[PDB]
Each structure stands twice: as structure tokens, then as C-alpha cells.
Amino acid sequence: GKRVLIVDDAAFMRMMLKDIITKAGYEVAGEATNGREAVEKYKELKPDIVTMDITMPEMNGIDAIKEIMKIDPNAKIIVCSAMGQQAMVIEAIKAGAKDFIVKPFQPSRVVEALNKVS
Ligand SMILES: [Mg+2]
Numbered sequence: 001g002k003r004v005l006i007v008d009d010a011a012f013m014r015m016m017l018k019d020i021i022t023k024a025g026y027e028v029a030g031e032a033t034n035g036r037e038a039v040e041k042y043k044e045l046k047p048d049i050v051t052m053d054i055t056m057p058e059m060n061g062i063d064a065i066k067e068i069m070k071i072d073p074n075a076k077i078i079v080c081s082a083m084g085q086q087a088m089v090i091e092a093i094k095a096g097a098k099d100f101i102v103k104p105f106q107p108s109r110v111v112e113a114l115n116k117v118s
Contacts, residue, residue, distance in 0.1 A: 001048025001076065001118050003029035007038040007061070008053035008080065016105055017051065024111045035059020039067045042075075049117055050077045052097065054088050062092050069096040076117050 004026050008014050018028050029047040032038040034056045042050065050068065054061040061079060068075045079092040079100040089100045101113050 003027050003045065003048045004114075005030045005032060005038070005041055005045060005047035005050045007032040007034075007051060007056075007064070009033055009056040010053070013053070013080075013103060017110070020105060020107050020110050021114065024107075024114065026114060035061065035064035035067075038064045039071070042068050043071060048076060049114060050075065051101070052077055052079045052092070054079060054081055054085065054092065062088070062095055065092055065096045078113055078117060 004021050006014050029045045030041045032041050036059045052061040077097045079097040081089050082103050098117050
């Protein structure tokens with residue numbers, strides 16, 4: 001799989017990630033700025049992978065993961081968290097997420113993750 005859907009309410013964070021993914025070979029299927037959008041885009045783009053920011057407006061990542069799973073129980077979701085946001089990561093994993101990555105990014109780490117998920 002190679003199409004990616006980046007979800008994060010922070011432009012910069014998207015930018016960065018978009019650059020990493022892209023140089024690593026992946027394709028940026030799309031961008032989402034919140035949970036809702038994340039789901040809408042998901043149904044529309046059928047990304048191969050999804051990266052998920054937890055803390056966003058309107059709808060958080062955890063709920064979005066839950067939603068996507070209901071739509072696609074084979075969805076491939078990596079969750080993004082700051083450090084120490086450990087209790088949230090457990091909840092996202094439990095909810096569906098295959099793995100997580102910390103912010104601010106570490107291209108090596110980011111890439112590995114993306115690859116295992118494939
Ligand atoms: Mg956020």
C-alpha cells in the first residue's frame with residue numbers, strides 16, 4: 001500500500017509529515033484537519049494508510065479511529081502523539097490503531113512505522 005491520508009489539525013505538522021512520507025516513496029492521498037474530515041476523506045479516498053493526530057477540534061482521533069474501523073475493519077492507522085500522551089496512545093491502539101509515532105517526527109521512525117504497517 002502507498003496512498004496516505006494525513007490527519008492533523010496543525011498545518012506545520014502536516015507539512016513536515018507530508019515531506020517525510022513523500023520523500024520515502026509514499027503518496028499523499030489527502031489531508032484532513034479533524035476527526036470528521038478524517039472520516040469523510042477516508043470513505044472518499046480509500047487511503048492505504050492513515051496517520052492520526054489525537055487532539056483536534058470537533059472530533060478527536062480516538063473517535064475517528066472508532067468510526068473508521070466501523071467503516072473499514074481492515075483499515076491501517078498509525079496514531080500521532082506528543083510525548084507523555086501515553087494514556088491516549090493506549091486508547092487509540094485498543095480502538096484500532098496498529099501503532100503510533102511521536103511528535104515532533106523522526107524520519108527514521110516515521111518511515112519504519114509506515115513500512116511495518118504495510
Ligand atoms: Mg493536534
